[PDB]
C-alpha cells in the first residue's frame, strides 16, 4: 500500500510567521493528483491546493503548494490567526483509492 507521511507532526508558530509543511509518499507519485485539505473543527475539510501546485477557488495567496515528484510541501506566506487548523495531504490512485496523511496541527 501507499502511506502518506506528514512531517513535522505539529507546528507552534506565532502569527505572521512563515510555515512549511511536508508530505512524503512511499512510492513515486504522479504530482498531478496530490491535494491539500484544511480541516478546522466544525467546518468540513476545505480544499486548498489541487494538482500539488494550483490554488482552489477562494483560496488566498498565502496558501501555495509546491514540491517535486517525490516530496510534496505546503507553505504559508504569512500565517494568520484565522488559519490555525489541521492540514492534510491527499493522493489519488494506488492502494487504497484515496490516501490521506496522518495530519499536521498548527498552533499558536
Amino acid at each position: 500500500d501507499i502511506v502518506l507521511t506528514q512531517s513535522p507532526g505539529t507546528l507552534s508558530l506565532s502569527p505572521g510567521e512563515r510555515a512549511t509543511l511536508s508530505c512524503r509518499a512511499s512510492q513515486s507519485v504522479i504530482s498531478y493528483y496530490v491535494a491539500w485539505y484544511q480541516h478546522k473543527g466544525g467546518q468540513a475539510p476545505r480544499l486548498l491546493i489541487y494538482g500539488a501546485s494550483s490554488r482552489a477557488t477562494g483560496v488566498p495567496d498565502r496558501f501555495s503548494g509546491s514540491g517535486s515528484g517525490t516530496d510534496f510541501t505546503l507553505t504559508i506566506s504569512s500565517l494568520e490567526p484565522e488559519d490555525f487548523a489541521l492540514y492534510y495531504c491527499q493522493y489519488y490512485g494506488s492502494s487504497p483509492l484515496w490516501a490521506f496523511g496522518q495530519g499536521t496541527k498548527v498552533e499558536i
Binding site: 513515486s28 504522479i30 504530482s31 498531478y32 493528483y33 515528484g69 489519488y92 490512485g93 494506488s94 483509492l97
Partner: protein, 156 residues
C-alpha cells in the same frame, strides 16, 4: 461505410502479431475503422495510416532508406494530423497528461463485437495514467455507445 486501404477483418482493418506489443491478434469492427477515413482528431487514426502505409511500402517496394526517408518528408507527413501533433507537444511542455502515441484504450461489446474508436492512454512524469485516473471518462464513453447502437437498433 466505404473503406480505405493502401494494402489488402471483414469491413475493417486488422492488426498482426508483429505490430502489437503483447497480443497475438487484436482488431476492430467496421464502424470504428470507417471513422478514421473522415475524422482526423484522433491520434489512433494516425497509427492506422502509418501502419497501413508501412505494410504497403514493404510489400511493393524493395528496401531503401534514402528514398523512403525523402518520400516521408514530402508525402507521408500529410498522413499525420498536424493539429494533434502540435497540441500534444504543448501539453508536454506544460507538464499535463499528454499522449506519446504508444498505448490506446477502447471498449469492446461483449457479444456484437462493436468497438469504440480507441483513445490514447495518456502519460505524465514518465508513467501512464493509471486505469482509475480517468474512470469517469470511460463511463461517458460507455454511455455514448449505448445511444449510438440504440439509435440504429430501434430503427432497424
Amino acid at each position: 461505410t466505404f473503406t480505405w486501404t493502401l494494402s489488402d477483418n471483414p469491413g475493417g482493418y486488422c492488426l498482426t502479431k508483429w505490430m502489437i506489443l503483447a497480443a497475438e491478434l487484436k482488431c476492430f469492427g467496421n464502424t470504428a475503422v470507417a471513422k478514421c477515413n473522415v475524422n482526423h482528431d484522433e491520434e489512433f487514426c494516425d497509427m492506422l495510416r502509418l501502419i497501413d502505409y508501412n505494410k504497403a511500402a514493404l510489400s511493393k517496394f524493395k528496401p531503401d532508406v534514402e528514398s523512403a526517408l525523402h518520400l516521408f518528408k514530402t508525402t507521408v507527413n500529410s498522413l499525420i494530423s498536424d493539429q494533434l501533433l502540435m497540441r500534444n507537444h504543448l501539453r508536454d511542455l506544460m507538464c499535463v497528461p499528454y499522449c506519446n502515441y504508444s498505448k490506446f484504450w477502447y471498449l469492446e461489446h461483449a457479444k456484437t463485437g462493436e468497438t469504440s474508436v480507441p483513445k490514447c492512454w495518456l502519460v505524465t512524469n514518465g508513467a501512464y495514467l493509471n486505469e482509475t485516473h480517468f474512470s469517469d471518462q470511460i463511463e461517458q464513453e460507455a454511455d455514448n455507445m449505448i445511444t449510438e447502437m440504440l439509435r440504429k437498433d430501434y430503427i432497424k
